[PDB]
Every structure is written in structure tokens, then in C-alpha cells.
Design a protein around this nucleic acid. Structure first.
Ligand SMILES: [Mg+2]
Ligand SMILES: [Mg+2]
Ligand SMILES: [Mg+2]
Ligand SMILES: [Mg+2]
Ligand SMILES: [Mg+2]
Ligand SMILES: [Mg+2]
Ligand SMILES: [Mg+2]
Ligand SMILES: [Mg+2]
Ligand SMILES: [Mg+2]
Ligand SMILES: [Mg+2]
Ligand SMILES: [Mg+2]
Ligand SMILES: [Mg+2]
Ligand SMILES: [Mg+2]
Ligand SMILES: [Mg+2]
Ligand SMILES: [Mg+2]
Ligand SMILES: [Mg+2]
Ligand SMILES: [Mg+2]
Ligand SMILES: [Mg+2]
Ligand SMILES: [Mg+2]
Ligand SMILES: [Mg+2]
Ligand SMILES: [Mg+2]
Ligand SMILES: [Mg+2]
Ligand SMILES: [Mg+2]
Ligand SMILES: [Mg+2]
Ligand SMILES: [Mg+2]
Ligand SMILES: [Mg+2]
Ligand SMILES: [Mg+2]
Ligand SMILES: [Mg+2]
Ligand SMILES: [Mg+2]
Ligand SMILES: [Mg+2]
Ligand SMILES: [Mg+2]
Ligand SMILES: [Mg+2]
Ligand SMILES: [Mg+2]
Ligand SMILES: [Mg+2]
Ligand SMILES: [Mg+2]
Ligand SMILES: [Mg+2]
Ligand SMILES: [Mg+2]
Ligand SMILES: [Mg+2]
Ligand SMILES: [Mg+2]
Ligand SMILES: [Mg+2]
Ligand SMILES: [Mg+2]
Ligand SMILES: [Mg+2]
Ligand SMILES: [Mg+2]
Ligand SMILES: [Mg+2]
Ligand SMILES: [Mg+2]
Ligand SMILES: [Mg+2]
Ligand SMILES: [Mg+2]
Ligand SMILES: [Mg+2]
Ligand SMILES: [Mg+2]
Ligand SMILES: [Mg+2]
Ligand SMILES: [Mg+2]
Ligand SMILES: [Mg+2]
Ligand SMILES: [Mg+2]
Ligand SMILES: [Mg+2]
Ligand SMILES: [Mg+2]
Ligand SMILES: [Mg+2]
Ligand SMILES: [Mg+2]
Ligand SMILES: [Mg+2]
Ligand SMILES: [Mg+2]
Ligand SMILES: [Mg+2]
Ligand SMILES: [Mg+2]
Ligand SMILES: [Mg+2]
Ligand SMILES: [Mg+2]
Lengths: 124, 207, 62, 144
RNA sequence: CGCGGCACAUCCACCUUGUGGUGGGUGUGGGUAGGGGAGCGUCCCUCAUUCAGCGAAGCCACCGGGUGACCGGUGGUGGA
RNA sequence: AUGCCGUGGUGUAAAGCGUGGCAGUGAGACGGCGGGGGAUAAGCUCCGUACGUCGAAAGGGAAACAGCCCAGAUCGCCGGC
RNA sequence: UAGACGGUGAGAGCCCGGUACGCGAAAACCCGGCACCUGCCUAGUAUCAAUUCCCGAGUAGCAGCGGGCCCGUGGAAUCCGCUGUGAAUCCGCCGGGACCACCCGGUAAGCCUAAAUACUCCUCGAUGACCGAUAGCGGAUUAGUACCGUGAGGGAAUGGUGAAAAGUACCCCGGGAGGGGAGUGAAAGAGUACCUGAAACCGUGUGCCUACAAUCCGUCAGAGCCUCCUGGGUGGUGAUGGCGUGCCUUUUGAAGAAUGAGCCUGCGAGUCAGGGACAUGUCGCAAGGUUAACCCGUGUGGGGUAGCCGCAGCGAAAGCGAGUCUGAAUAGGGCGACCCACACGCGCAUACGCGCGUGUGAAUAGUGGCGUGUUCUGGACCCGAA
């Protein structure tokens, strides 16, 4: 029972090259070079799926802090204020409403200021 | 238990008793699988051969000197990595027959025959053709009246040539001698039909 | 072919009724003058082969 | 009915063969050898221990000789004679070969393990002392 | 930590209370050498069954699918 | 002082032990602590250390940066600490 | 009695060659018979008695040196070679593992001898869980050819139109090649560069991006264009932001400026044998299990008990034996036996139990088969020296 290899062998090659469409140079043309880049691509994608959770929250905090200092509060103390006020709205929606509904964001700043301790700097 | 002997082109003449300790053995699936695979292994003739690097023509010299050519060192033009070279671990002639114990063979036989008898796929017939000149037409008609389904074993004595010739040419019909009964053939057939003397010879040989 | 048992092992080990492999002990062949009787009696007789020699010894005998 | 395709090996009877050196997901490149030394390419003989005098050479030969002329006896015990011959009677070498307590075509001696409650007339080769003792105690006879 | 999916080990309760399934716990699931377990794909044979010149194989494209090896559908090409 | 041996309680699933099958490994590295050699040099060398990490460990920190610090990646999330 | 197989314009028992089956040989060769022929016998037999003679020579034996047997010279028997010495003819001589005695066996130094055994250049007939053009023979093809070597030697590569050449008349461009149109064909998406026609590789057209940017070439985030469908969703592209040190081997440690890889396609490495060994999974039978050769069967089936393992061990051994060895030991130690779960049955404890027996384990306890891992001897996972 001599078995030709091609029929079985080409399956993974087709999958690798199809996944490697759009790559430039040999990385989209040559299975050996596409496979190396596929290992890197999937490692990168795995890394970046859990890195984007920090990336988007970094961006949300940037936007939240910008809106906060338009309403004359640091992000520092606005987050205290919402914690103390018991507001559990996460920074996804805080940033998104800082963009879409700035007046509601100003209201949230007002409640955060109110919840802040009078001397934010003395020990508790 | 009670299987009546059917006559070709006619009515039942008598009946024959089918001993329980021999046609009612419980079916042992693992046992019969073992026996059937050993049987097919013995059927395999295993004349498959390739040529190792030492049996391939030529290939005696070292093709070029070990060092300095800039090529991989090779040692022989018939090394397995070469096209046209020897085959590594390739098929060599083998005998695949196994040494299954006798009572394992016998138990598999009785299990298969018992399974046929238990739902009534075993018949006994006086003769396949009522005469001496073999006739496939009459043998086929009578077998079709006996069973209407494709795979029938016929167990006839070696001294009946007319029946053997008259069923030899029917598709789905397999002929065995009583002493040649075997698990693979009975399990392939969905109907096993004995001649009277063949079935009696089987019962007598098996006590 | 058929496996050949190791000759020297077959003359230095044997099996007991329950399958234990026994052996005699070294240092009783010569230079016996300075060896006190406690040591020669310790070295006398047969002992069971050590647990971590058992596998190689069985392989040799088989 | 039971056909050729209703036939199947017993569970666990047919284990798969480990195909070595067939990629990283299984026993991969080095095929379980892991090594770069002798074991990576060859076998180490069981008799070799790196150069110290091996176990089959450190130790002395077992003492003694084997007797070329040793007479070997198949063994039957009066206990199993009692077991196989509850009613007693004549007991012969051929008889207890047939009943299966002793190999054929060998000198057989009777030993005294077990109880005898059977009136037995045993004709064997070279009984044991306790064998005769309980054979006669049960009322039987022990004859060469 | 939250919410959802999977897996392994083990425990408790129902179902032929161990071939074991179901529900729920608890713990666990980075990994080289290496061990153990379970699978994918190719070819050949047997048995059964089912497709195929109203178009098989192979190949190509697209759309889908599975926890993985991989799989399916549709169309094109093709000719057993 | 630790460490070690025993013992009695308490706690702790994947402890331990015996005996089989199959191993690989037997080139280690650095860091902490105790020492030898060295010139109380070496990214040196040689030991000790129920010491660690790397090896075989990704993630975060240390600009970069096996061996340091934090922390051990079953998968997903554009949630939180 | 034919449904073997192959061919025939696609899977044919009934179209063809055939097949089952039945016939068939001038001659040659083979085989056998009858003759003819050749050779042997037609004269011995029995008994008595053991007086005489006969049995195969430079041989045996012996010594030396070697060889060969399990025997590697050992106390070296048997057998063989050479050297020396060198017998005897049965009231002899040789062997029975130094040797001696006894006893047993046999007749060396002459020859011939069928069958069972080995093999296949070659001839028929079949077959294949064998290969299918880098495979299978080196050789489907000029194949031991071409080619290489002075030579011995070494030694390739190259198969497929179509069912049928119907192999493209004729016309046009072109010197031709090649092509276009016509035509043949089911198909020219079969045109003697020809079945299918992958990849590397090379163009052409086209959508997006790209000439201020430092890029392991991707990944995540992400605008804008383009496309195709219902602002939305596909598919293409990707301005811009972040992250991000190839793969393999081998290393304490490599992105490493250590190794290997130009690319693609094809090929290229734990295999097989054995009643081998160990361990396990599974199945059969079970105090038994199993056959080997071989025999008989169209087969894989049926016989086949020789043997093997289990059945008792201890001891150097004689031997003894549930014991045995050491030992002076009714001392101690070593090794070995006290074999399993469920049940009944007894000689009986009030009904509940020591022992002993049936049984039921159809893993009991072994044994045999089959699978797997390891191992042994083989090239033994593959490749590689000098
Ligand atoms: Mg791109
Ligand atoms: Mg996070
Ligand atoms: Mg050669
Ligand atoms: Mg060579
Ligand atoms: Mg070849
Ligand atoms: Mg047989
Ligand atoms: Mg001595
Ligand atoms: Mg002394
Ligand atoms: Mg690799
Ligand atoms: Mg090693
Ligand atoms: Mg090493
Ligand atoms: Mg290596
Ligand atoms: Mg030495
Ligand atoms: Mg893991
Ligand atoms: Mg983890
Ligand atoms: Mg591993
Ligand atoms: Mg058509
Ligand atoms: Mg079509
Ligand atoms: Mg195919
Ligand atoms: Mg597909
Ligand atoms: Mg399709
Ligand atoms: Mg298709
Ligand atoms: Mg070392
Ligand atoms: Mg070392
Ligand atoms: Mg060290
Ligand atoms: Mg120090
Ligand atoms: Mg150092
Ligand atoms: Mg240290
Ligand atoms: Mg790290
Ligand atoms: Mg880190
Ligand atoms: Mg960093
Ligand atoms: Mg916080
Ligand atoms: Mg045909
Ligand atoms: Mg001589
Ligand atoms: Mg000799
Ligand atoms: Mg003579
Ligand atoms: Mg003669
Ligand atoms: Mg002769
Ligand atoms: Mg002969
Ligand atoms: Mg022949
Ligand atoms: Mg032929
Ligand atoms: Mg070829
Ligand atoms: Mg020439
Ligand atoms: Mg034309
Ligand atoms: Mg045209
Ligand atoms: Mg036409
Ligand atoms: Mg076509
Ligand atoms: Mg071409
Ligand atoms: Mg073509
Ligand atoms: Mg620009
Ligand atoms: Mg820069
Ligand atoms: Mg980028
Ligand atoms: Mg390492
Ligand atoms: Mg180095
Ligand atoms: Mg490099
Ligand atoms: Mg470089
Ligand atoms: Mg190097
Ligand atoms: Mg290179
Ligand atoms: Mg002994
Ligand atoms: Mg004792
Ligand atoms: Mg069993
Ligand atoms: Mg196998
Ligand atoms: Mg080699």
C-alpha cells in the first residue's frame, strides 16, 4: 500500500496560503515562508486580543481625563468622586458619553465633586 | 431445533434435529471477530516486496569524495534519499496467518451457525437438483423458493457434483464442504442451506 | 530467531520457588586469613539480588 | 441476523500503534530518544555498565555442579490423590496421568501433603515416608 | 474579580448506583526532554449501504463549519 | 539562631511509600545568603543553601535587556480591582 | 456444468475473444504393454566333528604437530591431515569421553545405492488488502542503450490526442515559424508543443495604497476610497497610532554576526521476522493449556501429544520432600508451603465455623491466541567517513 502524499499534504498548504493572502513578498506566495509568518501572526493576534483590553481602556481614560479637565476636575479625583457617589459606570461608557452627551458628563462631574471629601488631601 | 428438509420441486419429505449444544452456542462477538480476522489474514497472500538500498542495482562506489565538493556527503547513489534509491522499511514478503487455537475456531463456527439457526436462516435440502445432470436454472429456482436474499452458503458433500455445478455459477452463492465450514463464510451468508448428508456429516463430526 | 540467555548471569544468579533471584556474595574466594569469621559468615550463603539490580539481572537471565 | 459488519473487536483489545517521528503534536523529532549520545542512535547492551566490572562479573559463580545423572520425579501428593480418587481403589501411574495430576512418561513419586480419607491402593515409584504413613493410615497400600 | 465557552481530576445525589450517564459542587488546565490518553487526514482490503457520463477523481474559486489535525456546501474545470 | 531526628495534636485532595511498564537527564546559567581557590580580580572558578529565577515561563516593570522585581498565559470580553 | 478475464465509442453472462464443458495429433519426443532379446537356475541338501586355513596395510595403534567436533589441548574420548614408528585376522580388531577389569555393541582400512531434501537461467498456467512512469527491474521509452572511464567498471533520462486521424481542406497575415477565420470532433476549455493540468515562476488588465520616510514586513486599533448587495452589511485596499528580535538545529544562553534552508512540486527516516524476552490490554479454555513438523482438504478447515509451559520445593550433590539446606542441635538462620471472592455440602458449633469437598468465577492459576510498549539477533529510525 504505497500512498502518494500530495492529496493529504496540500490541505494545510492551501489553508496557510489562504490565511496568508495580503502578506507581501514570499510570505503570501511560499508555504514555508507563509507558515512562519502565520505563527507570528497568530501569536501577535493572541497577544493583541488581550492587549487591546488595556489599549481601549487607555484611550477611554485619555478621553475621560480630557473631558474632566474641560469640567475642571482631574481624572484622578473624578474617579474617586464616582466611586464615593456609588456610580459604577465604567470608563467605556464614561468616555463614550463624554463624547456623545457632554452635558450628562458635566452632571457626572458635579456628582463626583459632591462625593469628594472636603479636604481631598487630609487622612481619612 | 426442528428444521424440515425441503425437496427440490416438491414438498417436505421429513425433518432433521439440530442439536442445541452445537447450533445454539451463544454468539461471542469478540471471539468471532478474532477468528474472522485471523481467517482473512491467512487468506492474504502477502507477496509485496520492495528493494532495500543494498538490493538496488549499482550504488557500490561512494559517488564523490567526502570533502571539498560543496555538496552533501552521500556514500552511495542508492541511498534512500536518492530518487531511484533503496526503500527504507518498505514491504517485504510476509505470511499473515495467525495461530488461533482450535477451540477458538470451533467456538466461532458454532456461534455463527447458532446465530443463523436462532433466527431460522439454516435450511436442509435433500438435493439441489432432483436428477444427475446439473441445471443452474432449476437450482436457482429452487434456491429462490428456499430464500429470496442475496448471500447463501450451500454446504454439500464432496460426492455431489450435480448440485455443485448447478449452483456454482449463481451470484451470491458460495459452496463449502461440511469439513470446510468456517466462520467467515457462514457469517457472510445470510442463508445457510445444507444437504441432508452434509448437515449429518457436520453433526457426526462434531458429535 | 530465539533469544540466548546470558551465560555468566545464568551461572551467577538463580531463581527461587516464588521467583526471587538469588546470588552469592563476593570477597569469600581468597585472602581469607585476615577476614574474621563474622565477615566470612556475613558473606556466606545467598542473598536476594538488590531491588534496583533486579531489572537488569532478570533481563540477563531471560 | 449477525453479519460480517456486525463484528467487532473487544473493547481495549486493539490499541493503536504509536507512530513515532511524525510531527510535534506527537512523539516528535527525536522520537522519545531526547539525546545526543549513544542512546540517540544505538542500543546499549544490558550487560554494559559504563566500564566498571558488571554485575554478571563482580559476583562469584553459584557453587556446585549439576548432576548429569539426576533422576527427576513428577510429584503427586496424597492430598490431590484423595481429591481425584474420593472412593479410593487401585491407583496407578497411568491412572493419575489420565486424571491429570502428573505428566506422562515420567517416574512419579507420591508425597505427603494434604489429608487421606480414601482406601487407596497406589502403585507409584519411590513414595515419600509421610506418603506411605498416611496411605497405610487410611487403610490403603503403597507399592512400587 | 465579573460574565460566557471548553477541558482534566475528584466528590456528592438520581438513572441497570460503575460499561457507566445526568445534575451540581470543589480543585485544577505555562511548559523543553520525556511519559500517558484521545483523535484528524491519505491509501488499500472486507462487509453493508449509497452516489456517479443528468458527470466520479483530481484541481480552482467562493460561502460556511468544528476545540485541533481538519470538514462541509455551492459553483467552475474535468472526464471514471 | 537556624537546620536535623523523633513524637503528640491541628491542618492540608492530586502527600508519602512499595512494586511493575516507559523514560529523559547525568554540559547547566545567573541572582541572594555561607564558604574555598584567585589579588577576600573577573559576566572567573569550586562547593553549600525544603534559596529563587532562567533552563522549560508568556504577561507587567527594569529605555533595550534568559537568570533582578511583580506575577505563573484554558479560551473569549471595546467590564472592574 | 458458461456471472473467469479481457475487448467493444461509458459498469456487458446473453456483441466479440473466450469461459464451464466436450473433442483433438501426420510426425517428433515422453510414458506404458506385448513380443523379440539378454542374463541367472536346473544340482544340491541335511547332520556330525571342530584337527587345519580365510576375512582387504605402510592401514590401525602409538608418539609429535595441527584441524574439527559444545570441547578455545584440557584428564581429551570419537573423527580428519602430515611426520615418525608400526601391528594382528576372530583364543583378532574397534567403540562404549583418560585409563584398567568386566560386560555390552560392532566388524575399519573397497565400491555402489532410489525416495523423502536444495535450487529456477528457462517453459506453461494462475495469483497478489504488490508497484503504477521520481514508483515498479538499472531498463514500460535506442537499455545495459546513450553517456562516462585507457580499462576493470559505472550507467541514465524519456509513457498517455481522440472512440475513430475523422491529424484542421480552403482562404487570409507571414520568408518561415506561428496564428486568424473556416472545417472535424461530444470536446480543439483534446491541434501530433496534444488526458487531467497544481505550485514555483513570468506577463497583461484592473480596484485601493504608495515619491518627508528608518518597515522580522505581521498584529491590534483605524480614517478614507473602491466594489457588490440591502444608513447598514460584504469583499478589496489600508492614510494613520500602538505592539512586535525570522524558522530549524543546538545551546547556560541565539533575532543572532553559531548551523541548515534560493523557490516550488515530487520523493526522503522506529520497519519487519521469530510458538524469541519482559510487561501490559483483550479473548479462549482452565488444573490444565497449547500444539511443531507433518497428514488430509479448492481456503482461511479438520486432524496431528512429539514437545513446551503450568502442576513442589529445598540442596553443590547424593538425596529428602511441605518441607529442605547448614548444623552436634527437639538451636538459629536461608529458601519454600500455608493460594482467592461468592456459595452449598459434609466430620457438626442451638441457628453464626476450622478443616475438606463439589461449584461459579466461563483473570481462577496458568496456558494459548491477538493488540500495544520495551527488548534480543538481524542494516534494525535514516544519512555520513577516513
Ligand atoms: Mg495587507
Ligand atoms: Mg487586564
Ligand atoms: Mg552494494
Ligand atoms: Mg560506503
Ligand atoms: Mg528502482
Ligand atoms: Mg490447524
Ligand atoms: Mg574457595
Ligand atoms: Mg576463616
Ligand atoms: Mg522539526
Ligand atoms: Mg540520552
Ligand atoms: Mg549533551
Ligand atoms: Mg539532533
Ligand atoms: Mg578500568
Ligand atoms: Mg498543558
Ligand atoms: Mg496557569
Ligand atoms: Mg514533549
Ligand atoms: Mg457527455
Ligand atoms: Mg460540466
Ligand atoms: Mg483515488
Ligand atoms: Mg474546501
Ligand atoms: Mg464539487
Ligand atoms: Mg469536481
Ligand atoms: Mg558525564
Ligand atoms: Mg557534570
Ligand atoms: Mg554546579
Ligand atoms: Mg560568595
Ligand atoms: Mg560563571
Ligand atoms: Mg548560588
Ligand atoms: Mg519572563
Ligand atoms: Mg517580562
Ligand atoms: Mg518594554
Ligand atoms: Mg484603580
Ligand atoms: Mg468482466
Ligand atoms: Mg595422531
Ligand atoms: Mg580438536
Ligand atoms: Mg574388514
Ligand atoms: Mg564393507
Ligand atoms: Mg554413494
Ligand atoms: Mg535423493
Ligand atoms: Mg518449480
Ligand atoms: Mg509466467
Ligand atoms: Mg524507473
Ligand atoms: Mg570509450
Ligand atoms: Mg485555423
Ligand atoms: Mg475557431
Ligand atoms: Mg460540429
Ligand atoms: Mg472535455
Ligand atoms: Mg506541456
Ligand atoms: Mg493538457
Ligand atoms: Mg507622502
Ligand atoms: Mg527609530
Ligand atoms: Mg503597524
Ligand atoms: Mg537544554
Ligand atoms: Mg557556547
Ligand atoms: Mg544565522
Ligand atoms: Mg543575519
Ligand atoms: Mg558548531
Ligand atoms: Mg547556507
Ligand atoms: Mg536446583
Ligand atoms: Mg527452616
Ligand atoms: Mg484469562
Ligand atoms: Mg503488526
Ligand atoms: Mg550508519
Amino acid at each position: 500500500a504505497r500512498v502518494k502524499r500530495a492529496v493529504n499534504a496540500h490541505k494545510k498548504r492551501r489553508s496557510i496560503l489562504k490565511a496568508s493572502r495580503g502578506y507581501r513578498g514570499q510570505r503570501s506566495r511560499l508555504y514555508r515562508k507563509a507558515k512562519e509568518q502565520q505563527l507570528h501572526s497568530l501569536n501577535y493576534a493572541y497577544r493583541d486580543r488581550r492587549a487591546r483590553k488595556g489599549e481601549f481602556r487607555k484611550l477611554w481614560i485619555a478621553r475621560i481625563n480630557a473631558a474632566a479637565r474641560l469640567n475642571d476636575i482631574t481624572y484622578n479625583r473624578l474617579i474617586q468622586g464616582l466611586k464615593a457617589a456609588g456610580v459604577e459606570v465604567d470608563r467605556k461608557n464614561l468616555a463614550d458619553i463624554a463624547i456623545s452627551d457632554p452635558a450628562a458628563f458635566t452632571a457626572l462631574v458635579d456628582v463626583a465633586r459632591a462625593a469628594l471629601p472636603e479636604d481631598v488631601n487630609a487622612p481619612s | 431445533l426442528k428444521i424440515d428438509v425441503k425437496t427440490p420441486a416438491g414438498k417436505v419429505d421429513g425433518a432433521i434435529e439440530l442439536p442445541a449444544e452445537l447450533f445454539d452456542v451463544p454468539a461471542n462477538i469478540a471471539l468471532m471477530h478474532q477468528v474472522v480476522t485471523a481467517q482473512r489474514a491467512a487468506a492474504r497472500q502477502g507477496t509485496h516486496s520492495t528493494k532495500t538500498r543494498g538490493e538496488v542495482s549499482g550504488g557500490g562506489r561512494k559517488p564523490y569524495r567526502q570533502k571539498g565538493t560543496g555538496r552533501a556527503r552521500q556514500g552511495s547513489t542508492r541511498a534512500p534519499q536518492f530518487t531511484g534509491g533503496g526503500v527504507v522499511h518498505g514491504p517485504k514478503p510476509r505470511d499473515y496467518s495467525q495461530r488461533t487455537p482450535k477451540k477458538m475456531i470451533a467456538a466461532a463456527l458454532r456461534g455463527a451457525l447458532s446465530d443463523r439457526a436462532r433466527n431460522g436462516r439454516i435450511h436442509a435440502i435433500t438435493e439441489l437438483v432432483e436428477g444427475q445432470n446439473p441445471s443452474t436454472k432449476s437450482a436457482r429456482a429452487f434456491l429462490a423458493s428456499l430464500t429470496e436474499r442475496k448471500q447463501v452458503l450451500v454446504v454439500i458433500g464432496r460426492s455431489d457434483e450435480a448440485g455443485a455445478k448447478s449452483v456454482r455459477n449463481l451470484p451470491g452463492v458460495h459452496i463449502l464442504a461440511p469439513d470446510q465450514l468456517n466462520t467467515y463464510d457462514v457469517l457472510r451468508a445470510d442463508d445457510v442451506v445444507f444437504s441432508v448428508e452434509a448437515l449429518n456429516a457436520y453433526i457426526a463430526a462434531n458429535t | 530467531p530465539k533469544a540466548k540467555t546470558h551465560s555468566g548471569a545464568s551461572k551467577r544468579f538463580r531463581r527461587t520457588g516464588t521467583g526471587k533471584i538469588v546470588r552469592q556474595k563476593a570477597n569469600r574466594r581468597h585472602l581469607l586469613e585476615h577476614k574474621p569469621s563474622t565477615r566470612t559468615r556475613r558473606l556466606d550463603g545467598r542473598t536476594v539480588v538488590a531491588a534496583n539490580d533486579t531489572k537488569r539481572v532478570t533481563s540477563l537471565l531471560n | 441476523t449477525l453479519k460480517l459488519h456486525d463484528l467487532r473487536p473487544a473493547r481495549g483489545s486493539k490499541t493503536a500503534r504509536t507512530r513515532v517521528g511524525r510531527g510535534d503534536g506527537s512523539k516528535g523529532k527525536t522520537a522519545g530518544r531526547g539525546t545526543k549520545g549513544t542512546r540517540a542512535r544505538k542500543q546499549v547492551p544490558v550487560t554494559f555498565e559504563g566500564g566498571q566490572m558488571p554485575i554478571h562479573m563482580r559476583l562469584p559463580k553459584l557453587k556446585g555442579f549439576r548432576n548429569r545423572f539426576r533422576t527427576e520425579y513428577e510429584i503427586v501428593n496424597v492430598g490431590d490423590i484423595n481429591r481425584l480418587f474420593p472412593q479410593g481403589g487401585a491407583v496407578g501411574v497411568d491412572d493419575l496421568v489420565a486424571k491429570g495430576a502428573v505428566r506422562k512418561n515420567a517416574l512419579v513419586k507420591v508425597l505427603g501433603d494434604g489429608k487421606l480419607t480414601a482406601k487407596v491402593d497406589v502403585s507409584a515409584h519411590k513414595f515419600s515416608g509421610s506418603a506411605r504413613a498416611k496411605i497405610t493410615a487410611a487403610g490403603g497400600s503403597a507399592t512400587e
